[PDB]
Amino acid sequence: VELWTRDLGSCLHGTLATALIRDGHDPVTVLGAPWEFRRRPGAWSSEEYFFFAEPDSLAGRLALYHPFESTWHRSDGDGVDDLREALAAGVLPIAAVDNFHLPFRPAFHDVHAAHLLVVYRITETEVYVSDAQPPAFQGAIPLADFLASWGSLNPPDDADVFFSASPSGRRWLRTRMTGPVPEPDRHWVGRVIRENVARYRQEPPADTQTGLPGLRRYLDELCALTPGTNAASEALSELYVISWNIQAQSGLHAEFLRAHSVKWRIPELAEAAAGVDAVAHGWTGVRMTGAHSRVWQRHRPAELRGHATALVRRLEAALDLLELAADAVSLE
Amino acid sequence: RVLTLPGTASAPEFRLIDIDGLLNNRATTDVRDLGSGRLNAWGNSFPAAELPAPGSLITVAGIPFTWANAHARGDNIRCEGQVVDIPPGQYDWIYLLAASERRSEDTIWAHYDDGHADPLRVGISDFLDGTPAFGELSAFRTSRMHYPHHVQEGLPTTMWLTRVGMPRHGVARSLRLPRSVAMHVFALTLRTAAAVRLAEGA
Numbered sequence: 001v002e003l004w005t006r007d008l009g010s011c012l013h014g015t016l017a018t019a020l021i022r023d024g025h026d027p028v029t030v031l032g033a034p035w036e037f038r039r040r041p042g043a044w045s046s047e048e049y050f051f052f053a054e055p056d057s058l059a060g061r062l063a064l065y066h067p068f069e070s071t072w073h074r075s076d077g078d079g080v081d082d083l084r085e086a087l088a089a090g091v092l093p094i095a096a097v098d099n100f101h102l103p104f105r106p107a108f109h110d111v112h113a114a115h116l117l118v119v120y121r122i123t124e125t126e127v128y129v130s131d132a133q134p135p136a137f138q139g140a141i142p143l144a145d146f147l148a149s150w151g152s153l154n155p156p157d158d159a160d161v162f163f164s165a166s167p168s169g170r171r172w173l174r175t176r177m178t179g180p181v182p183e184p185d186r187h188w189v190g191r192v193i194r195e196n197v198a199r200y201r202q203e204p205p206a207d208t209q210t211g212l213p214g215l216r217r218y219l220d221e222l223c224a225l226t227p228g229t230n231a232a233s234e235a236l237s238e239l240y241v242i243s244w245n246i247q248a249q250s251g252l253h254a255e256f257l258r259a260h261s262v263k264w265r266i267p268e269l270a271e272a273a274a275g276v277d278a279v280a281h282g283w284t285g286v287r288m289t290g291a292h293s294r295v296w297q298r299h300r301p302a303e304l305r306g307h308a309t310a311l312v313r314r315l316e317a318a319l320d321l322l323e324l325a326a327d328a329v330s331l332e
Numbered sequence: 333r334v335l336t337l338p339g340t341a342s343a344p345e346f347r348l349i350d351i352d353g354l355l356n357n358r359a360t361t362d363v364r365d366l367g368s369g370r371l372n373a374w375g376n377s378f379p380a381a382e383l384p385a386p387g388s389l390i391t392v393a394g395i396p397f398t399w400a401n402a403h404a405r406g407d408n409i410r411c412e413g414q415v416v417d418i419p420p421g422q423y424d425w426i427y428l429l430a431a432s433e434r435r436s437e438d439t440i441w442a443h444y445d446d447g448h449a450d451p452l453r454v455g456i457s458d459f460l461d462g463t464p465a466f467g468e469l470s471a472f473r474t475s476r477m478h479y480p481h482h483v484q485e486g487l488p489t490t491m492w493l494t495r496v497g498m499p500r501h502g503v504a505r506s507l508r509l510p511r512s513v514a515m516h517v518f519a520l521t522l523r524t525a526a527a528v529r530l531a532e533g534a
């Protein structure tokens with residue numbers, strides 16, 4: 001069981017990577033290949049691991065191009081019996097927990113936050129957990145502590161307006177790679193890039209803001225709200241939450257491009273990687289400006305609008321670079 | 333074909349920029365100021381005990397810097413597009429000690445006495461057990477991180493030395509910092525231009 005995460009990432013990619021590494025799969029290939037933007041109004045939840053996945057499963061969407069899929073489960077007991085069976089079956093359970101009750105987290109008995117970690121061994125007194133989010137921990141934990149975390153009510157917390165008020169619910173995540181993986185050759189990388197670009201450019205559905213046009217409309221709606229108002233507060237809370245793992249995907253995708261750039265010595269792939277990483281860094285200006293307005297009342301509409309159009313422009317520059325890359329990897 | 337020729341560089345001069353009047357944020361705290369940390373939106377801060385003494389002269393990777401003479405309302409510059417005057421002259425490099433709330437990249441403007449201005453790319457990596465995404469050098473890596481109510485063991489806070497070139501052969505007069513609340517500047521040193529020529533042999 002190997003700890004894996006990235007500085008732009010959350011427990012969502014991190015736990016899935018641990019599961020992927022154990023079955024012999026490269027997380028940068030599986031999780032770094034897809035790259036998108038989507039937002040469904042009303043979909044988000046106050047969890048560190050929220051990602052919009054419909055019509056696919058959570059892992060299926062995060063691994064768009066691989067037969068990787070996931071299922072959510074809720075254990076109905078008072079103990080950890082359902083988790084012992086899953087381990088016995090060879091499954092690696094991903095547990096939904098509250099940081100408030102994990103002794104090894106900085107938030108322990110300070111702040112409520114909804115979180116994911118890997119369970120890898122269960123005795124009768126201790127649960128063995130693996131959690132790569134800084135500060136990474138891996139080892140045994142008192143079973144009462146785990147059960148408090150797994151069953152927490154995650155009540156609304158004034159010190160976490162982002163990942164509180166989402167009960168752990170004793171729910172957990174099973175993952176499986178359900179068939180042969182595609183050969184990650186140059187043609188496949190070509191198609192992966194071309195599909196990401198085409199999805200980014202296409203006209204969104206009626207019910208979902210997607211891609212480049214969706215991101216524009218979304219950012220415009222954000223900047224229209226009056227700072228300080230209740231609508232602006234719920235809007236900025238959604239912004240910080242949904243954009244963590246969207247920013248995460250951008251940084252992961254750039255790594256996927258860098259890795260194949262070194263593999264085949266195609267500079268078009270490193271140049272595109274730099275464009276995609278610029279989108280990742282663009283999210284920082286937008287996210288952090290919203291985060292300080294929401295939390296400390298630092299209302300700066302001019303900065304928020306300025307980072308927003310900078311993000312859109314960086315996204316437009318990336319897409320063009322990605323198309324040159326796809327051309328250099330393969331003929332369409 | 334390959335041709336390599338030895339060069340010689342002059343002794344440049346380091347101009348250490350007094351930024352004490354631009355300090356607007358508290359990103360470092362002591363065990364008795366833990367609730368004043370504003371490095372990020374969660375109230376974290378650098379451990380003061382593992383950082384330099386205010387006003388001391390230090391060297392990171394050979395580059396000299398003055399540690400800020402902090403007041404209780406500021407120990408660094410959270411970047412809001414401040415304009416910084418620099419001694420007029422011909423320069424080669426800008427050196428910043430900095431960190432960012434997550435990695436980001438932005439622009440430093442350099443203003444020259446004939447009205448030309450140059451947009452200069454700068455990247456700053458994360459304070460949270462960061463890795464240098466832009467090729468920065470490591471300036472500090474603490475053992476602990478400060479939280480609003482405790483000192484956290486085994487969690488490094490990271491600060492970076494980042495380098496920004498000034499290509500223009502012309503007299504620079506001021507710089508503009510980026511407009512991004514995510515970016516924190518702790519010191520700023522400029523390096524003068526120096527002459528290079530072919531050396532003795534060849």
Ligand SMILES: N[C@@H](CCCC[NH3+])C(=O)O
Nearest residue numbers: 048099107111113160163
């Ligand atoms: N470290 C998380 C905050 C999670 C809530 C506190 N454990 C972040 O950077 O957004």
